[PDB]
């Protein structure tokens, strides 16, 4: 389990229907494409792995005619054991890949909270919220500059340092 979900974030936004991962902001809402794509491609990867899996089988037991009793209870025991095995394989599979699923969906959030952290650089500060604080007036252009992933910390450090230390 990574920090992001069911952790320092206390809530998920029902308003966001456009993507899994998003940006909200006070200013004077959007969602990141690449992160969602990264998180959905891997759900489709084991959706893909799961959907296509089979050997041809014949009818060893008969429906309409009584079979020899010893070979019949041997067939019943064999079938019952194969059924138990496959049920266990099944429950293990779904529990493992659900675990992996959630843990990853956490990881792809944190991977690009760690993008933003390292893009804002020293021009912003970490909070308990998980919702970054900007100390300098960024218009809708600065914020878009956050989300596109082109930007320049250089162009604002001289400014923001003055706001952090006074």
């Amino acid at each position: 389990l990574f920090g992001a979900i069911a952790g320092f974030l206390e809530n998920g936004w029902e308003g966001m229907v456009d993507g899994w991962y998003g940006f909200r902001h006070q200013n004077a809402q959007a969602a990141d494409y690449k992160s969602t794509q990264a998180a959905i491609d891997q759900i489709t990867g084991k959706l893909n792995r799961l959907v296509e899996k089979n050997t041809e089988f014949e009818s060893i037991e008969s429906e309409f005619s009584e079979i020899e009793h010893q070979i019949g209870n041997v067939i019943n025991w064999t079938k019952d054991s194969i059924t138990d095995i496959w049920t266990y394989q099944a429950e293990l599979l779904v529990a493992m890949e659900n675990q992996h699923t959630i843990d990853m969906a956490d990881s792809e959030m944190l991977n690009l909270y760690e993008r933003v952290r390292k893009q804002l650089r020293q021009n912003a500060e970490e909070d308990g919220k998980g919702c970054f604080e900007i100390y300098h007036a960024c218009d809708d252009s600065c914020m878009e500059s956050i989300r596109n992933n082109t930007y320049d910390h250089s162009q604002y450090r001289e400014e923001a340092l003055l706001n952090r230390l006074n």
Binding site: W20, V51, A90
Partner: protein
């Protein structure tokens, strides 16, 4: 002036199971077990023969019910619940092996034995228990040999089937077991009866046995059926004092085909490859829970109602 990073949530999310948590709510999920299958038999892309009330053995011996299934080719052979194997009361030795062999086939061809009989033999013997149309009759692929004049001793006879093929042929005969020590005398005479059969790979002998038995389909007598595989180049000899129910033709099982036991109605629009006693299953899903017992290209059966595979993050909102 700030910026918020957050994940999305839904109004109604679905619960799954994980390694460490039961009842774990998630944004979305898809099941991995299929609990619903078509009631009909889905046979598109498959040329098939439906037997209805004709049992597979009947094809090999010629029970009237199987008249329209004495010959044929098929991807898929469908057998039904109360299909008739015998018009004249009897049984077959190692019947399940044979039946399976028939369901494992992809067609049957039939071939005259060319057997001919002595003037002191009535090879047109019939029975009330095997009706074709309104007439008294008998198995199509078999002939019930009795002495032409009631009561004379049935002549010592010898018939040898000769196989000149590059494949093995399945051959089936029968042995009559009369009801009354009179009936026997009226059919084969009073002499001690015996019926030896023998090929390069099969040897056996059959004594008819008069016994008091309950009447099945208005007959106390019984015909027991015996079958063997005659190899290419192999001959098979019958030596009989009377009692032998003898093959007019012989059967060549051909190819490989999927045998099905069911009562589901056939359907020719729906595609499938996995079949069971009621209906068919076609599903992307790897797992299934309808039938513990299935035939063909089939998804592994598991004893669970549902297994939801989560397709997203934890569902957590306000």
């Amino acid at each position: 002036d700030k910026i918020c990073l957050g994940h999305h949530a839904v109004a109604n999310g679905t619960i799954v199971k994980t390694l460490t948590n039961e009842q774990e709510e998630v944004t979305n999920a898809t099941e991995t077990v299929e609990s619903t299958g078509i009631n009909r038999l889905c046979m598109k892309g498959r040329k098939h023969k439906d037997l209805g009330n004709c049992h597979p053995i009947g094809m090999l011996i010629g029970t009237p019910a199987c008249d329209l299934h004495l010959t044929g080719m098929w991807d898929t052979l469908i057998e039904r619940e109360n299909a008739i194997a015998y018009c004249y009361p009897g049984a077959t030795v190692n019947v399940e092996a044979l039946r399976q062999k028939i369901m494992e086939s992809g067609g049957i061809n039939k071939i005259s034995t060319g057997f001919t009989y002595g003037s002191s033999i009535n090879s047109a013997g019939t029975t009330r228990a095997c009706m074709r149309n309104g007439g008294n009759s008998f198995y199509a692929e078999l002939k019930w040999l009795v002495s032409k004049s009631k009561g004379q001793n049935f002549p010592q006879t010898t018939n040898t089937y000769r196989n000149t093929d590059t494949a093995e042929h399945l051959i089936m005969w029968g042995i009559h077991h009369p009801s009354s020590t009179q009936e026997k005398n009226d059919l084969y005479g009073t002499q001690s009866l015996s019926i030896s059969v023998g090929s390069s790979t099969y040897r056996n002998n059959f004594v008819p046995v008069v016994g008091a038995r309950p009447q099945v389909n208005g007959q106390s007598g019984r015909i027991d059926f015996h079958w063997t595989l005659v190899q290419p180049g192999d001959n098979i000899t019958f030596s009989h004092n009377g009692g032998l129910i003898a093959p007019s033709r012989v059967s060549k099982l051909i190819g490989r085909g999927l045998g099905i036991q069911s009562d589901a109605p056939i359907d020719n629009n729906c595609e499938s490859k996995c079949f069971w006693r009621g209906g068919s299953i076609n599903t992307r899903l790897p797992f299934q829970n309808l039938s513990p017992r299935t035939v063909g290209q089939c998804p592994k059966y598991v004893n669970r109602r549902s297994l939801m595979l989560a397709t997203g993050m934890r569902n957590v909102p306000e």
